[PDB]
Subunit: 80 residues, 4 copies
């Protein structure tokens, strides 16, 4: 990643690994080590992601928001 | 939220997302991104919440307390 | 507690809540909010506890050790 | 360990305890408190490890990488 990986990884139902970085992104990494997608927030993603029953990925950011990200890497919503 | 979301979200049995904020609050957010409730502690909620078998939400605060919050957002107890 | 509760709580099989504090202790709190026991390490317990299959509670400390604590609050071992 | 254990332990299917240290290593500790192996990254391992379905251990490092480590302590891959 572009900065410290302070965030703790979460593992999806299909093995996808999700983790934040101080480079401001939430990363979705395939089990083979190849990027699935990254999603840019406005600040360090120190928070560790959680995965909902429908696969939504939730994570906080130092930009003050809680993010809900769809499994395909598109924003679902953010809460300030 | 009002400050960095350092805390890592927890997901309840009904999909509710709980997370602390450096704005001093524990947040309960519905899966649709709308606030269910927030609970104010005396300092940053860096700690990440855990959910008990009866749904109680437990989280630490930089105000020195461990909080137990009922699912409706009312204080159950705090331990110094 | 005596200092910031940075650590994230873990919940045991019987509902006991375990959490570290920057006051250097690992706390075991009953679901009713009353202390079961506390265990003193040599520095802040920022690490969040994990519970093994036999109930052992594991947590790191800023004193450089990983601690294994028995369910009764007595040290099992520490690893430097 | 050689430095603060900020990381939060993860427990494997066989009881192995995995945790990072600010000494830059990911540690695998047997339930008896004896080292199984340690793996050196390039910076503090503040991130808390997660365990995949095949036992792979994933953890971030302040060296900017997400690491995937095999259960025997050998690198599987790292993602920058
Ligand atoms: Co750096
Ligand atoms: Co930045
Ligand atoms: Co801010
Ligand atoms: Co404040
Ligand atoms: Co204080
Ligand atoms: Co101290
Ligand atoms: Co030290
Ligand atoms: Co260093």
């Amino acid at each position: 990643t572009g900065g410290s990986v302070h965030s703790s990884p979460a593992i999806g139902q299909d093995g996808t690994i999700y983790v934040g970085s101080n480079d401001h992104y939430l990363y979705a990494i395939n089990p083979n080590g190849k990027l699935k997608w990254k999603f840019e927030t406005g600040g360090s993603v120190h928070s560790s992601p959680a995965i909902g029953q429908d696969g939504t990925i939730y994570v906080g950011s130092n930009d003050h928001y809680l993010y809900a990200i769809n499994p395909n890497g598109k924003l679902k919503w953010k809460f300030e």
